[PDB]
Amino acid sequence: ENNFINLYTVKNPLKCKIVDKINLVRPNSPNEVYHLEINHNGLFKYLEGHTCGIIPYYNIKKQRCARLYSISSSNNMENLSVAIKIHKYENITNYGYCSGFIKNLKINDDIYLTGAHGYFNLPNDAIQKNTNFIFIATGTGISPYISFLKKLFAYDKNNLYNRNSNYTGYITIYYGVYNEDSILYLNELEYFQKMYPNNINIHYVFSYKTSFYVQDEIYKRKTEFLNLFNNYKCELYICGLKSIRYKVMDILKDEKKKKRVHVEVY
């Protein structure tokens, strides 16, 4: 620990089985996205904030080309989660490489993963320090913050009535999708806000209705927002598309005291 990075490469993928395959979005979201419940036998080692690689079709032509997908489960969960938007052109029409693999994916199917990737992780002392957070996400970008939240708060899906252990840090989440029906992991987000009204705050920026996104909602709250960052030393986390970085970073008006600003973009 924690040199989990690259325990399984494309040179040695890990046979895993699908355990569940669930639609993350309701009928009012244009996008299609599947949460995967993946059985790795406790063998696949990873760390909240980590991405895993899936090699489409691993047993024509090869076909040994992988895509990364952020894990959205806590280390502490028997099987692991992951969320995948199906990409189409341009329904019943055409698909991207991985997209199509996952579109035809069936339960108890072989899926081949690749060792931990990335460094978007939480701080190590975060759980004891009661450290504070500002998570910023678009679309599938919420994944890491779900895993983040399953850790900070007690996860158990089967024990959702207690207790639960509290990090009592303050967490502010800016989440931007198209509409309500397009927000990944609603059941959990709604639950977290419900169980911990003094620890988690969610700002949803919806695309539908010049254009207005999550950085624009962050500017519009810029005086309030900085408090969080400096007064509560709120840790900075950006995950999603490039565009987010500039408008939130250039709102800083610094010193390698900006450390803890984590930018991940895909």
Ligand X SMILES: Nc1ncnc2c1ncn2[C@@H]1O[C@H](COP(=O)(O)O)[C@@H](O)[C@H]1OP(=O)(O)O
> To the nearest whole angstrom, how small is the minimum distance from the Cβ of residue 67 to ligand FAD?
3
Q: Return the number of the residue (6 or 12) whose C-beta is nearest ligand FAD.
A: 6
One residue of 243, 250, 258, 266 binding ligand X per CB under 6 A:
243
- Judged by CB under 6 A, the residue of 32, 118, 216, 245 near ligand FAD is 118
Write the DSSP assignment of 107-158 as a string of letters.
TT-EEEEEEEE---PPPSTHHHHT--EEEEEEGGGGHHHHHHHHHHS---SS
**Can you tell me which of 96, 226, 241, 260 binds ligand FAD, judged by CB under 6 A?**
96
Query: By the 8 A CB rule, do 44 and 80 touch?
Result: yes
d(CA 4, CA 6): 6
Binding mask 55-94 for ligand FAD (x = CB under 6 A): ------------xxxx------------xxx-xxx-----
Query: Contact with ligand X (CB under 6 A): which of 25, 55, 183, 244?
Result: 244
Minimum CB separation from ligand FAD for residue 159, in Å?
A: 26
- Rounded Cα distance, 203 and 193, in Å: 11
Q: Strand 14-23: give its sheet, edge to edge.
A: 67-70, 51-54, 110-117, 14-23, 32-39, 80-86
> Looking at 73-81, 95-103, 128-136, 217-225, which segment touches ligand FAD (CB under 6 A)?
95-103
